[PDB]
Design a protein around this ligand. Structure first.
Ligand code: PMR
Ligand code: PMR
Ligand SMILES: [Cu+2]
Ligand SMILES: [Cu+2]
Lengths: 401, 420, 429, 403
């Protein structure tokens, strides 16, 4: 079901909103019109009041008429903003729809910009516009842009890749050290405080399902992905760490015994909320490519019944273990016209609906409970600690009516 | 090319979508890129709308360029007509659309649908959102608002109230109750409660009421010559402005003033003995044009404050802004940048500042009491409780809304001094 | 014992609350020089343009024994001559009770042509709500007498008294509801009434009780002598509004209707903006009717689970306990604020809804706060239209209840977001 | 003669609690007096103040000794929650005086088992006997006899002065040449000054008649001088103090020349808004004559009628002598007849009670609530401009609003 009649998604510029949270040494210059500025501003909400690192310079008629004018204005503006923020070192010239239609070559501009700025301050660009990407594609485009700049390493190290809340990263490091074997290098390192060397030696695993261009970036270095269920829910995290153990030759008994208490706490937390969502139907809409893992977790751990799962793009090569864990019940789908999937929603009568915020209130008025997928990227749902809170996010035992 | 971190307005298609969703029976087709679809979030959620905004987007991508954009647009309009069934349809363009060689008007003509269509030429890089709302309004008016025989009873039209407006749902109610106060009937409320039949009957009014200039002024002037429709010039925000507006409408309609002062309490509470300390308090005002003008008038006259800073992001109304600022002997600050107004409130250091969400948050950073009196707001500013900003009730609302920050800070200081 | 805060004051301030809500009514009170701050209270909180029509003897140490009786006589006579009221109430203060001076006999000696109401009430074991309720009883007993009823259906609004939490917008909203369903208001008492209105009181067919704290006794007296049934429901919240509408329609015998177009609370609570709003625990303390209605709207409409309920009305202890048993908790009936301090420390709720005491203790504890009860200060009496009843009452209730919560959410988000010293170098050690 | 509108003596308790950090004030009033002090300075009560009420049940009225033992147990309990209190005050409420409870022997027996740190003082705050700041006067007169006897020549500054004003006063006195700047309302009990035959005191607030009489009984001699309201009155005070200590006029001029110009400019900076206004007075706190004389002479206002609770001629004399002959004094307050006289006079500004403040405004009369000057610092040179602005505040608002 790949009908293109009408689509309701977000630009990858929405990735900048929480992407800058991982690295506080990243400034983002958006070559976008007033509309993209309004999108970033609205979606960020209370951020803009705290001076973020999102610089969305409007393409006025003056610099949009020509091409090189914007190119020189880019250098002038980055010099300005480096003066404003001496702390800032990493710069990203994110692509936007006006830049794509005017075909502004951001790559050469970023290269000469880094050349003139020098080694201390380094600028790498990518394109997060909605013309060629969508929503979550911005983040893996960004990191794949910074992958080649990372030096090759000759040491076999356990690799974590993916923007993630800092407490979740710390707990994952703690768990993998509790495993005992596998040095962890954080590719989205905090404010680039440790430039993570990536080369053929470092075999990697994936924590965030949507990271598509990430795999290509790490195959260019030579790293290989390992088939591992994405760490959603207690069993998802358990099978993930089991996969890491298998790759690094960790004894099954050792890792089973080591992680007993954390997964006991996780099963307690998940059973605390499992009883809420027993024996209901759910419908998934294409929001952030995070839906198939969610469907697996809900269906097998929370007793959910998944009617449909809508994903804008399926990277089956990496989502394969997820699909194998996933039941045959829910119909997989790569990009469904919003009205068509809306018709299927009306037909299916989903007790719970996962979709964008824009659709959410209309479905609520139609009488269907809605859970907006724009939230779960922000809130931590990614491991044992948040295994219970993942289900709690879908509990919604409102039942006011 | 200037770096903006927070802007006070939106792209003009946002205002056009405001007017589109305000009135029913319309559908709004964007030539917008995929992912520019976010604009219905704010309507579904900030305004808390139970219905999908009457909009459809083609959502073109890199693969769809040249002819594919035109075919996608044609399919989008055809399916919008077939499944949404709008009584009126209009064609619009986004920022990226005009850069591509895609003719919205040509595509609409090629569709040749029975329902009348209008081509909205939106200078998305020359202008801003309120202009877009106003242009959509005048364009629809010339499309399907034709002059026709007067009503039996003197009738008026409220022009200006659009969606995403400040309290607009409440100002329409207050103005309507007042006009029923003189008994003059409102023939059509547009664009907040308009319809193709309503726009058709818009010419039936004996005069127009400019409830909000930024979104209805050009429509009123178009009705001035096309329909010979006089429009009122005074905005009734505040007691004195309410009386001026009452006199104006009584003159235009010829009916007696018959003003009702029963529910008003703001003058007695401002002259109340507990309100002495408000006198001589410096205030900075920024935001929507008529809102700031009326706020300055109300402050200086009825509140006892001294207007110490005046400004407006509505550049198209800088002339009234400058005129009022000179009237108070101030210096109008017409910047659209948060940093200039930030510096202005730093230098002036008013006791209280009343602007929009930017002003609220910068005052929070500056430790200054603040209130919101303008359009750009978050979700919680729009209340479920009816909070008219205009009329006699609006006077009391404005009064205690301004009072709250002051008394909060004052009692906090009293506590701090007292446990010390 | 030691006292530093009182939710309810002496009964006499409630008696003169009814007095000043009344019109043409003059309270002659045997008080010492200094018991004159209640006039200050009214002209400050109620912001009354007219001085509270309450006269004071303000006797001195020298004026004692035979002199104070003549002083009370003089106060009655010059009050009557100066103000020309159509009726007089006489009462005593706490000190005046100690001295054996009978206000009733002193007033009788004057033989004023206007009726004289004898108000008798202990000043130590009672509270202001007792003063208000007993004053309403005395005026109803004296001025109101049974008589023929108006041909068309009409109702009488008893309960809204001066210095009451949001009573001016309250009566307007309730009258709007009754006129929307067609019932007219023959008289509204004590607010906006006249002694002639008190005489016409019985002309209505059925009665309506907005504030049981100040009208339940008058409602019972009307039920027995005037043969007028009164409603048991107080329309705070959407569900309570519908129940009240049904009950008053049944009493009147007309078709129940409602203006739900103005109402927006159910939709505004069904949106996702209230999804995080589920699970919050709320502590409720105040007057019985307000606390019970607030708990009911909180549990159903607001997505709240009550964690603590309490009041200061010993008279209304039984209904509050009966209601609280339904919620699973137990009532907290008391007037000491150390008790509620300890309770709020033990339960540690996320939101506290109560009178000014709860507001400030929440401020001290760093907990969001809201005001729902009667003991308040000047800031809580608004110039705007802020009713607590009807569909608009529901919208106001939702707005003012979520305002502290959205404020706290915003400040916490801002604090967390620009969090200082973001290193977490343990990530990749 | 008739109905009076004053506040019973417990209204002072609010500012005495701030003046002495060490002093706690137990009222023994009913729910009426507890309500008075509760519906009063609401911010104070939310910040754990040092005053409370011992409301007495029905059995506590007939049983005198039962109430006595109850109060004793409250005193014993108080130290548990506040171990900082070292002196205590059983103020007299109207019901207590009606039930004839003797708090004098109560204080004696309570100090009997509290030694040596804790001692309790007894004075009356009963509206039947005291009126507003007369309670302040009675409190200071109560602590006066317990002060020790001494032979050292000391200048006593009696009056609940605000801390910053007290600092300015002591600094000015020290630079004048007058050494002793001891104050009877000491911040802490360790700073209590001794009073002897050669003690000489100056009265800051006009209503401290009982204190002046008490130090006269002890042997202290009063400095007859105008009260510190405005530049000129402060100048006359400081002159009188310099004469009583023999300080030269040259050093006095050198000290007082600098702040005098600033004070007169500050007064003039608010004089224009108030200029040419007839001002009516109502009896509130016995500071009306001094305030009137300042307003008239310095700011240039034509007072109509000056009203005070009661006049102490001996201490207040110089202010009346400096006061213009135009205004007529008033003893007592029948608020009905006083209001009628106010309507007859039609004054531009009326200083009166807050209960009459709003109704007077409703008739169109600008009103100034007289309780600022007791609470907000208006005394001495620095605050002369502040006090002038206090009176210029209401008239400017009245002009701006209407029309
Ligand atoms: C462009 C879509 C959009 C808009 C208009 C807002 C403002 C808004 N942000 Mg949701 N924010 C959008 C998307 C996002 N906001 C984000 C931040 C955020 C959070 C965590 C939340 C939020 C909310 C909102 C709200 C309240 C109304 C709504 O639900 O959209 C607006 C207008 C609020 C919510 O969803 O309801 C409880 C909430 O918990 N904004 C993030 C970062 C993950 C994204 C991608
Ligand atoms: C007696 C009851 C009462 C009432 C109704 C108010 C309203 C009030 N007490 Mg006034 N306050 C009361 C207490 C008192 N305050 C008094 C004076 C006073 C002061 C010092 C203060 C004050 C305040 C108030 C205020 C706010 C502004 C004002 O009127 O002063 C009201 C409505 C508060 C303030 O904000 O002043 C700027 C403050 O510091 N009032 C006095 C004189 C003895 C009393 C008994
Ligand atoms: Cu606030
Ligand atoms: Cu607040």
């Amino acid at each position: 079901l790949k009908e293109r009649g009408q689509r309701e998604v977000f630009c990858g510029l929405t990735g900048i909103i929480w992407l800058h949270r991982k690295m506080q040494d990243a400034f983002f210059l958006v070559v976008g019109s007033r509309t993209c500025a309004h999108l970033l501003q609205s979606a960020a909400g209370v951020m803009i009041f705290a001076e973020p690192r999102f610089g969305t310079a409007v393409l006025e008629e003056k610099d949009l008429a020509g091409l090189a004018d914007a190119n020189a204005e880019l250098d002038r503006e980055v010099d300005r903003l480096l003066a404003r923020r001496p702390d800032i070192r990493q710069l990203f010239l994110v692509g936007s729809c006006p830049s794509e239609v005017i075909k502004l070559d951001l790559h050469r501009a970023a290269e000469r910009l880094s050349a003139h700025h020098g080694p201390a301050v380094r600028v790498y660009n990518f394109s997060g516009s909605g013309i060629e990407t969508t929503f979550t594609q911005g983040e893996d485009a960004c990191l794949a842009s910074i992958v080649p700049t990372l030096p090759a390493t000759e040491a076999r190290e356990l690799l974590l890749v993916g923007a993630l809340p800092d407490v979740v990263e710390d707990q994952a490091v703690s768990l993998l050290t509790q495993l005992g074997i596998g040095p962890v290098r954080c590719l989205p390192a905090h404010h680039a405080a440790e430039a993570p060397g990536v080369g053929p030696n470092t075999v990697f695993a994936l924590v965030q399902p949507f990271l598509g261009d990430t795999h290509g970036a790490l195959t260019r270095r030579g790293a290989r992905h390992i088939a591992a269920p994405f760490p959603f829910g207690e069993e998802g995290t358990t099978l993930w760490l089991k996969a890491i153990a298998d790759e690094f030759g960790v004894s099954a008994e050792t890792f089973e015994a080591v992680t007993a208490a954390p997964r006991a706490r996780a099963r307690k937390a998940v059973a605390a909320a499992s009883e809420g969502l027993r024996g209901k139907s759910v419908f998934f809409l294409p929001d952030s490519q995070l839906e198939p893992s969610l469907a697996r977790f809900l269906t097998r751990e929370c007793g959910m019944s998944a009617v449909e799962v809508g994903t804008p793009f399926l990277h089956r090569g990496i989502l394969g273990p997820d699909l194998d864990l996933l039941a045959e019940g829910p119909v997989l789908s790569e990009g469904q016209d919003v009205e068509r999937q809306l018709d299927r929603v009306r037909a299916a009568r989903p007790d719970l609906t996962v979709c964008g915020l824009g659709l959410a209130n209309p479905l609520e008025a139609e009488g269907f409970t809605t859970k907006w997928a724009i939230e779960l990227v922000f809130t931590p749902v990614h491991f044992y600690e948040q295994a219970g809170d993942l289900a709690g996010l879908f509990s919604r035992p409102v039942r006011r009516r | 090319m200037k770096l903006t971190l927070w802007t006070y307005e939106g792209p003009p298609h946002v205002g056009a979508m405001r007017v589109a969703t305000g009135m029913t029976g319309m559908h709004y087709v964007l030539h917008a890129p995929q992912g520019d679809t976010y604009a219905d979030l704010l309507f579904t959620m900030i305004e808390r709308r139970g219905k999908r905004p009457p909009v459809s987007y083609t959502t073109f991508q890199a693969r769809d360029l040249g002819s594919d954009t035109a075919e996608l647009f044609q399919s989008a309009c055809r399916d919008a007509y077939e499944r949404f069934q709008p009584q009126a349809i209009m064609v619009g363009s986004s920022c990226t659309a005009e850069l591509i060689q895609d003719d919205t008007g040509g595509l609409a003509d090629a569709l040749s649908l029975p329902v009348p269509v209008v081509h909205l030429e939106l200078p998305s890089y020359q202008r801003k959102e309120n202009f877009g709302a106003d242009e959509s309004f005048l364009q629809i008016c010339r499309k399907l608002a034709r002059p026709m025989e007067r009503t039996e009873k003197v009738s008026c039209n409220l022009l200006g109230p659009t969606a995403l407006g400040f309290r607009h749902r409440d100002d329409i109610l207050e103005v309507t109750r007042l006009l029923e106060g003189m008994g003059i009937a409102v023939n059509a409320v547009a664009p907040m409660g308009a319809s193709p039949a309503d726009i058709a009957r818009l010419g039936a009014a004996h005069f127009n009421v400019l409830l909000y200039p930024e979104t209805g002024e050009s429509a009123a002037r178009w009705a001035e010559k096309t329909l010979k429709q006089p429009y009122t010039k005074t905005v009734p925000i505040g007691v004195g402005a309410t009386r001026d507006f009452v006199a104006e409408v009584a003159a235009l309609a010829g009916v007696a003033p018959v003003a009702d002062d029963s529910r008003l309490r703001q003058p007695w509470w401002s002259a109340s003995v507990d309100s002495t300390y408000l006198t001589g308090k410096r205030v900075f005002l920024f935001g929507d044009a008529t809102h700031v003008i009326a706020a300055a008038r109300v402050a200086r006259d009825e509140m006892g404050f001294e207007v110490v800073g005046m400004g407006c992001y509505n550049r198209e109304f800088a002339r009234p802004m400058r005129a009022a600022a000179k009237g108070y002997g101030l210096e109008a600050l017409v910047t659209d940048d948060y940093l200039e107004v930030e510096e202005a409130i730093q230098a002036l250091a008013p006791e209280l500042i009343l602007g929009t969400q930017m002003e609220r948050h910068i005052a929070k950073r500056l430790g200054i009491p603040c209130a919101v009196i303008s359009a750009p707001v978050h979700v919680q500013d729009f209340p479920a409780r009816y909070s008219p900003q205009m009329g006699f009730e609006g006077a009391n609302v404005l009064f205690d809304t301004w009072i709250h920050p002051l008394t909060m800070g004052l009692e906090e200081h009293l506590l701090t001094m007292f446990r010390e």
